[PDB]
């Protein structure tokens, strides 16, 4: 599904003589608000000893893209705990928004690495501003000046089940 | 990185000296004291003079 990005803040519950703990905040990519809070307490157990019943959400908010038209160049840290112990992975996606990029990555990870949605930590998604900081080859491919390329073998989707023309790619 | 990496490692590695040698002292400091519990204490502190010799 088409995700969303979520600022999620939790503060685990003030007790007597401990008012006001320190308002922990994460950036969560998820579909809806329910999965995000479910995803939220999950990280909070791995980081340290807080648990879901012990605390509460302060607030949750959706992060829109600041420039949803500008094509950006994204650097992504992913580590994941397979098949033996974990390891990082850095892949670069030329894309439009933050939430656009993660979508193809989950398409990518489920393509090659049989990676579940649970299997994956998104550590950090960074925009590369400056060209010639983009390191992968195939992202550097589309950056040369005055890019032109053909489409070869243009199929045409037929509507009805018959045609009379021996149709040809067009061209 | 590597400079910052080793001092993150050597403080771990210096503790392997300091913390284990704290125990291996106190592990033997209970050893003869457990041996002192049965046998007479004039004999044990006599034996403590034997161990300090060499």
């Amino acid at each position: 599904a088409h995700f969303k990005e979520y600022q999620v803040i939790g503060r685990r519950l003030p007790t007597e003589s401990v008012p006001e703990p320190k308002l922990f905040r994460m950036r969560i990519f998820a579909s809806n608000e329910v999965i995000a809070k479910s995803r939220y307490w999950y990280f909070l157990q791995k980081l340290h000893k807080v648990k879901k019943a012990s605390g509460e959400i302060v607030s949750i908010n959706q992060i829109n893209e600041a420039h949803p038209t500008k094509v950006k160049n994204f650097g992504v840290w992913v580590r994941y705990d397979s098949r033996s112990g974990t390891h990082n992975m850095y892949k670069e996606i030329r894309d439009v928004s933050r939430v656009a990029a993660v979508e193809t990555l989950y398409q990518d990870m489920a393509a090659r690495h049989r990676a579940r949605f649970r299997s994956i930590h998104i550590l950090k998604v960074a925009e590369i501003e400056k060209t010639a900081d983009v390191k992968r080859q195939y992202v550097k491919q589309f950056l040369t000046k005055d890019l032109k390329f053909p489409l070869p073998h243009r199929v045409q989707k037929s509507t009805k089940t018959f045609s009379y023309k021996r149709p040809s790619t067009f061209y | 990185l590597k400079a910052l990496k080793d001092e993150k490692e050597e403080a771990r590695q210096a503790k392997i000296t300091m913390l284990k040698e704290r125990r291996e002292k106190k592990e033997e400091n209970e050893r003869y004291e457990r041996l002192a519990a049965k046998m007479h204490a004039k004999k044990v502190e006599r034996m403590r003079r034997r161990e300090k010799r060499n």
């Binding site: 650097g75 840290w77 960074a126 983009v134 390191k135 | 910052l4």
Partner: peptide
Amino acid sequence: NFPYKAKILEEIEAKKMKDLEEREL
């Protein structure tokens, strides 16, 4: 292989610059 990588090292420092000072005084 990550471009914005050297920024992260000082962010490890500035949290630990406090943590040496905060636990004592």
